[PDB]
Design a protein around this nucleic acid. Structure first.
Ligand SMILES: CCN1C[C@H](C)n2c(c(O)c3c(=O)n(Cc4ccc(F)c(Cl)c4)nc(C(=O)NC)c32)C1=O
Ligand SMILES: CCN1C[C@H](C)n2c(c(O)c3c(=O)n(Cc4ccc(F)c(Cl)c4)nc(C(=O)NC)c32)C1=O
Ligand SMILES: [Zn+2]
Ligand SMILES: [Zn+2]
Lengths: 49, 213, 269, 269, 214, 49, 49, 49
DNA sequence: ATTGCATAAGACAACA
DNA sequence: AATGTTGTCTTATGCAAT
DNA sequence: ATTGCATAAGACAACA
DNA sequence: AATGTTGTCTTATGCAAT
């Protein structure tokens, strides 16, 4: 998975998640360290580098 | 349709405490509406047709009996406000109330059927009354009764499925607006339009389109 | 001379205009020296895939709950909207109990009919065992949006806001600033019902009710040009529906129907 | 037939389009029946006068504090901007105490000169008695924005965001992911100062530092068309400065300098 | 011309414990004085000083100094080479590489005390007021006048004037000919106001109808 | 002064207010009952009825 | 405020109105004798002399 | 991922990259051999045959 | 005329 | 008491070449 | 042509 | 698990009349 930054309720852009599947307007991302999948809308994620 | 309606208040013990049951039925479609009532009141009188109007529309006339809450000034003023024609009748007359006979019979039949179907015999749980009322409503309105070739909904609404836009005249190169065309999609400044005969779709500027008749 | 330009960007991270003006350099070299730095371009591409919708009436439904202060002590309301026809069904309850949703949907069925799928948020009683079992008994689908954004149900949320506006308008036009008497609750609700469903809204020439009972669907859409995902417009599809907001398109061979924002589609020729 | 339209709006609150379509009426009567209801239009006029700015260099200054984690254990920074020329000076401190505020200004004073006004938010130490008496001893004004909106000082906050972006770019472009060693703090701050002040930002052709030391001001502006509050565009004033965001216009007889939204002015003839 | 040669040295200030080492950077063409202070005479602190001096004044062309340990050390050498500034050394005290440094040093040493007696500090100002004192001294030395001319170093350094006219642009006339002798005033959207350089007559003109001159 | 409706930190819009001084981009507002003046940005007020 | 005339549904541009706070959607006029503040749309008004 | 040609600072368009990843102002492709995902701006890619 | 380009115009975000 | 700002990005457009 | 109008196009908000 | 929406409003445009 490629490296993206996702928002959280605080409003920052934390780094450390690979996206697994790409919906039309959704995505599921896996953390490097806590290696877990969470579903986030497409309009809430941006990559790094 | 939406011309004449009937109504009546009927008893039933299984939905205590709100055992008072209100009915209203159309003529041309025989559509039903039912509302619970803790007690028959001229205010609860208001509560019924308001719900009935929303589901069906605004009729042209209503006929009923001389009920106590059917004849107070509140109902008369309300119906005058909505501009609907009241016409009272004998509490039990047939030349007036005529479809409410079949309405009450079918409604009681369906209510008994469902109340015994879901494992109840004498008292519906207070939280489960509206369930049975809505289920009976849907069953009696969206399903044909007896020989009926159409359910009340088809007669009342004529639920066809058209597939063509309204007739629309398009600006021809001579400057005039030739009718017989129907719009298909309203895009950005461009609306795809077809000819009713050639069945060819053409993109045309939104400044060059206006409806027919 | 772009060696000093590269050094200047590495040690200073200067914008392309100032780099061009500070080392006698033109458009190109300024650009391909400014994009070399990874730190100068991180965010500016955030995808926006924005497309919930159904096609025909009684296919996709949405539902949420509303806290209406004037409706005390029965404030909670359940609102259901048909995505295809924008018709609205609401009911008044006191608890968020699953039984209330049971009743609200049952009345919604009685007025509009049986839909195919219902989309809603993961409410405390929406995914309850009894609710799911009863829904399966009725035999209709259920699909929860992403758990936490009350935004995938945007249709029912906007309908909620509109209904709140209309009911407040009626209430305070009837002379009730703070709350409505228990007597008038049903009359207000039904009057809002008749005002909303039976009269067209905004500018569309179609009443929501006769939109529902007399829907129009195109069996073969017109040719259009499509911003296919590769980034450039492509020729050879047909749009099924093109709403004010967003649109649906159909392939000419695969016959796939997808929901895409209206910006992605422009008319052919 | 407008009597039934009046009844329908009064008891139903229907939009003008539906009222026109449902009672065989047209534009006018539908309008002046829909605006009779006070409930059909409540909000839709929210005034927006958005105009802080100074005219010449060393006239109006702004200031705010910033919490920069990379600058630990001296994370707090004090940022000062000259509104006329958009020059920036930032100094590092460990506490938000008044003494730190004392230190920051004179360092900025030694670089830009002596201003006349310093707008700032009502910080716990900006309004401190020692700060006030020391400022009076120096002898320049002090104005505070509304107590609670960190938005009337929008220029210093925007320059704050820009400075934080630049310092982040410099820090993580050198190999310091989470924060900065104590040995790098001062040169990072100095490089950040040199980058913004002595080089162009965006598309303007005039460097901020030479804007400050070599400013240009028009002694008489060109004729323009002015949306005086009277409702429409009045003819007969001259604009002094017209920024991309917002502008200032001058009277031809009253000789009034006013900060006005840029949408309220357009060129004359 | 301004900003051609700089000068630098250190100066121990016992009145300023514990950060008793002070660095001074002086321009030659304008005699602008920039100072920063560090506790220990190392490299990193003094390159911090040079970076601050560059930030406040700009990038010079050459820096002359002594043959001190750090002044010719590697770190400084490649730092300057990356900056692209010509280093120069000399006799540690020669009247050429340190022609104005000692004059600036004595001026500063007079000013720091003068201010210390101004606020009544005799032996050592506390660590709080050191930066404020330095900033006040810098403002006094730079923006004011201690010579007997009519130009402060700032007036010497930046060429501070107050312009009245924008850059000249060649306007296009309706017949399609470019025409210089016009200078823009206001860059309003769509329409830009340009004044005839001779008649002082302004006119509103479309954006694409004007192009910069030369 | 004329009655206006002001937003607060919650985002609501409350009644019972009147304007004393009308600045170019500011306004001092005054409670109907408590009768206390505070200032507020002009973009945070909308009128009444 | 300067005197203005307001638009009435009857067809009278009645006098005795001075705008106190004027917005871009409507105004806040007050009468001279009754001295009552009302909000009337910007196309309901017309200045005096 | 369909094959795509990517761009380098060298001056050539090299092959051996399948876009797992598309964005509005970039793509992230991955090479068949190195199997490494890298965010490449959309300007630096073009279809492979 | 077609394509490409150089520029201009307009949109977005975030600062305790 | 005392008011949003603007760098960055994107799309649209006219010209210049082809 | 100048004014007004009829229309279209674009922009803001808020909903636990 | 599974994606913003659109009524209301303001501004701009063009035609038809004057
Ligand atoms: C009393 C000491 N104090 C502050 C209060 C705590 N505060 C202070 C700030 O610096 C900020 C600040 O920067 N921003 C960021 C911001 C938000 C919206 C905008 F439009 C813009 Cl221009 C800036 N917000 C706040 C705030 O309180 N609520 C949003 C804030 C501060 O120094
Ligand atoms: C878990 C049970 N649950 C909800 C969580 C608490 N929730 C529920 C809601 O109905 C809403 C809701 O309506 N809105 C309003 C809103 C805000 C922004 C938008 F874009 C749109 Cl469309 C709607 N927000 C929230 C919310 O969570 N945070 C703002 C919300 C709910 O039912
Ligand atoms: Zn960079
Ligand atoms: Zn109304």
């Amino acid at each position: 998975g490629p490296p993206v930054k996702i928002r959280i309720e605080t409003g920052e852009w934390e780094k450390g998640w690979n996206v697994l599947v790409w919906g039309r307007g959704y995505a599921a991302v896996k953390n490097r360290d806590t290696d877990k999948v969470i579903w986030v809308p497409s309009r809430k994620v941006k990559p790094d580098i | 349709p939406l011309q004449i309606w009937q109504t009546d208040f009927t008893l039933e013990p299984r939905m205590a405490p709100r055992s008072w049951l209100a009915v209203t039925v159309d003529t041309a479609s025989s559509a039903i509406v039912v509302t619970q009532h803790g007690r028959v009141t001229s205010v609860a009188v208001q509560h019924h047709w308001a719900t009935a109007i929303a589901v069906l529309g605004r009729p042209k006339a209503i006929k009923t009996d001389n009920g106590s809450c059917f004849t107070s000034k509140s109902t008369r003023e309300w119906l005058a406000r909505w501009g609907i024609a009241h016409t009272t009748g004998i509490p039990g007359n047939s030349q007036g109330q005529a479809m409410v006979e079949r309405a009450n019979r079918l409604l009681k039949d369906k209510i008994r059927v469902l109340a015994e179907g879901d494992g109840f015999m004498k008292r519906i749980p207070t939280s489960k009354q509206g369930e049975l009322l809505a289920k009976a409503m849907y069953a009696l309105n969206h399903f044909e009764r007896g020989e009926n070739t159409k359910t009340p909904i088809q007669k009342h609404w004529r639920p066809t499925v058209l597939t063509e836009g309204p007739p629309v005249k398009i600006r021809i190169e001579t400057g005039e607006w030739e009718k017989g065309w129907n719009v298909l999609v309203w895009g950005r400044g461009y609306a795809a339009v077809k000819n009713r005969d050639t069945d060819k779709v053409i993109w045309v500027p939104s400044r060059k389109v206006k409806p027919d008749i | 001379p772009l060696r000093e330009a590269k050094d200047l960007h590495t040690a200073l991270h200067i914008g392309p205009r100032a780099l061009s003006k500070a080392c006698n350099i033109s458009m190109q070299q300024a650009r391909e020296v400014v994009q070399t730095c990874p730190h100068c371009n991180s965010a500016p591409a955030l995808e926006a895939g924005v497309n919930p919708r159904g096609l025909g009436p009684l296919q996709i439904w949405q539902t949420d709950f509303t806290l209406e202060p004037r409706m005390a002590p029965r404030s909670w309301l359940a609102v259901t909207v048909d995505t295809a026809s924008s018709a609205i069904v609401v009911t008044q309850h006191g608890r968020v109990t699953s039984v209330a949703v049971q009743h609200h949907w049952a009345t919604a069925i009685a007025v509009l009919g049986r839909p195919k799928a219902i989309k809603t948020d993961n409410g405390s009683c929406f995914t309850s065992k009894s609710t799911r079992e009863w829904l399966a008994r009725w035999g209709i689908a259920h699909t929860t949006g992403i758990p936490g954004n009350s935004q995938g149900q945007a249709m029912v949320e906007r309908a909620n806001r509109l209904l709140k506006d209309k009911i407040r308008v009626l209430a305070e036009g009837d002379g009730f600033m703070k709350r409505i008497p228990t007597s008038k609750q049903g009359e207000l609700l039904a009057k809002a019902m008749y005002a909303l469903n039976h009269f067209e809204r905004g500018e569309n020439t179609k009443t929501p009710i006769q939109k529902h009972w007399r829907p129009t669907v195109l069996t073969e859409g017109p040719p259009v040009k499509i911003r296919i995902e590769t980034g450039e417009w492509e020729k050879g599809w047909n749009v099924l529906v093109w709403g004010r907001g967003y649109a649906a398109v159909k392939n000419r061979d695969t016959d796939k129907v997808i929901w895409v924002p209206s910006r992605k589609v422009k008319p052919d020729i």
